[PDB]
Amino acid sequence: MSLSRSEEMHRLTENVYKTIMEQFNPSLRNFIAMGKNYEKALAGVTYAAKGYFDALVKMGELASESQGSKELGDVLFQMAEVHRQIQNQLEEMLKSFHNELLTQLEQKVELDSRYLSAALKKYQTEQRSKGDALDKCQAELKKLRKKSQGSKNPQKYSDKELQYIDAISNKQGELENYVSDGYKTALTEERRRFCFLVEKQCAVAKNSAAYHSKGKELLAQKLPLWQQACADPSKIPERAVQLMQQVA
Amino acid sequence: MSLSRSEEMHRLTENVYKTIMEQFNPSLRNFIAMGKNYEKALAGVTYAAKGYFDALVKMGELASESQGSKELGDVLFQMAEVHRQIQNQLEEMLKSFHNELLTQLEQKVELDSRYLSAALKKYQTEQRSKGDALDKCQAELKKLRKKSQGSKNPQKYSDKELQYIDAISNKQGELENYVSDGYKTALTEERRRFCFLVEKQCAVAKNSAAYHSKGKELLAQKLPLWQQACADPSKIPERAVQLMQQVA
Structure with a gap:
């Protein structure tokens, strides 16, 4: 009962390590590769x-120097400025995407390659030698019982038998404890890795939110004004109207 | 005066067309080329x-299948969903950046490249023609005025002079009206081109604002839940706690 349940935890523990090594980490490496490509693509936009x-600023210059569209000069400059501020918040999220998400996850998979292997092998080696020591202890008692039973004085050897019964109970206790600790450890190892990934994602999402809110804010202020500014392409400047009046 | 002022307005009108052809359109062509580059970079992000x-969805699947991080599967799935909705808004701005801004501006430069030259030539020709017609009338008056002294019936002389003065002021009106109308038309041509540019940019910015406000909104409502979900990387699932209890 204790054996069955313990051996099951032993199986579960092994499955956890196998899943991290065979599924989690290779899929995480692909996630990292895909993220480097995304970083490359976003940096390309920069x-x-x-x-x-x-080029837009250049059109603003031409407008500044025009005979009748000078007002549209500053409009074009402020369109460029709004972008400059937005693209800057983007670069902030890109830095955090690189430094906090990609670098940290990569360092983690790199460490895991030797760590998980070693942690697993240590667990397996120790779990086995504990089982073996228990088995040996049980075989030793069984021999002793066959010997004492077929003897005129079975009472004599019983103090060593009681000592063997204790050793067996202690070893069984140690094995079960080792297996339940190993299982809690395996689960903690699994969960910490999913949590770290989610944690890193949240960090960049917080930067994306600041980037988007900045974008929304700057455009909400400026856009109605830009829409109003270009609204009348038939508008003659005062000087030109006065000049036409002079030739009249 | 009026003729030197009219000549000045003629100069200013020629300057407008010259500036559009020599400065505005070549600079707009560069702006379009830079736009196409921006467009390809944005397409690369897609x-x-x-x-x-x-790759994030794959991590969500693993979390769903995990022994103790199942609720993080849903968190990862919804990060990808928010990403997807945001990326979808970026694609709508990309669409209108192409279909409206780049496409329509290129259409405009191409029209100018074939026809603006002709509008200028037509104006120049009709302006010179109206100027020649005024010069002719003024010459006729000047010629008449050499035999002004000594003649009989100064009244019948005045009647002739009045016909020439009327002809002159008619031809002068025609030329000056033509030149002020030409100047107004050139200013409107210049302005329309700048306004159209600004108008196209406003249409893209409106799509950008929809994109940013979507990102801000979706992240505002999901992020707190994401931050809390991964806030405990040492959580052991209930089934596992009971398993370990059973053994000990």
Whole structure:
């Protein structure tokens, strides 16, 4: 009963390590690879966005120097400025994505390769030698019982038999305790790794939220004004109207 | 005066067309090229993000199948879902950036490349023609005024002079109206081009704001729940606590 249940925990414990080594960590390596690709792609946007908003600033310059669209100069400059602020918050999340998520997860899989192997082998080696010491102890008592039973004075050898019964109970206790500790440890190892992944994700999501809220905020202020500014393409500047009046 | 002012307005009108052709359109062509680069960079994020979120879903599956982190499966699945909805808004801005901004601006430069030259030529030709017609009338008056002295019936002379003065002021009105209308038209041409650019950018920014506000909203409501879910990496599942109790 205690044996059955203990051997089951032993199986469960082994399955946990096997699952981390064979499923969790290889899938996590793929997640990391996919994340490096994502980082590469987002970083690619950085450079491209800058030549875009530089080109936009250039149109703002031309507008500044125009005969009748000078107002649209500052509008174009503020469109570029809004981006500059947004793209900066992006770069903040990109730094945290690299430094806090990717680097930390990579360091963790790297450590695990030797750690999990070693931790498993140590568990297996010790669990086995504890079982073996118990088995040997049980065989020793069984021999002693066969000897004492077929003897005129069975009482004589019983003090050693009682001592053997104690040793057996202690060893069985030690084995069961070792197995239940190993099982709690295995579960803790499994859970800490999922939790760390979720923790790292939350960290970048907090940076994404700050990035998006900044984007929303800056556009809410500026967009109605930009929409109003370009709203009348037929608008002649005062100087031009005065000039036309002079030729009249 | 009016003729030197009219000539000045002629200069300013030619300057507008020259500036559009020599500065605005070549700079807009660079802006379009930079836009295409920005577009390809954004397109590169699309499938990189999909690979990353799919890898996150795989981690969610493992968590679902785990011995003691099952509730983190749902957390990981919903991170991918939030990612996906946000990425979907980015794709709508990408769509309109292409279909509306880049496509429509390119259409505009291409029209100018074939026709603006002709609008200028037409204006220049009609302006010169109206200027020649005024010059002719003024010459006729000047010629008449050489035989002004000494003639009989100064009244019949005045009647002739009045016909020439009327012809002149008619031709002068025509030229000056043509030149002020030309100047107003050139200013409107310049302004329309700048306004259209600003208008296209406003349409993209509106899509950007929808994207940012979506990210902020979804993250505002899910993030607290994500942060709490992984807040205890040492939690042992109930079934396991009972298992260990049974043995001991």
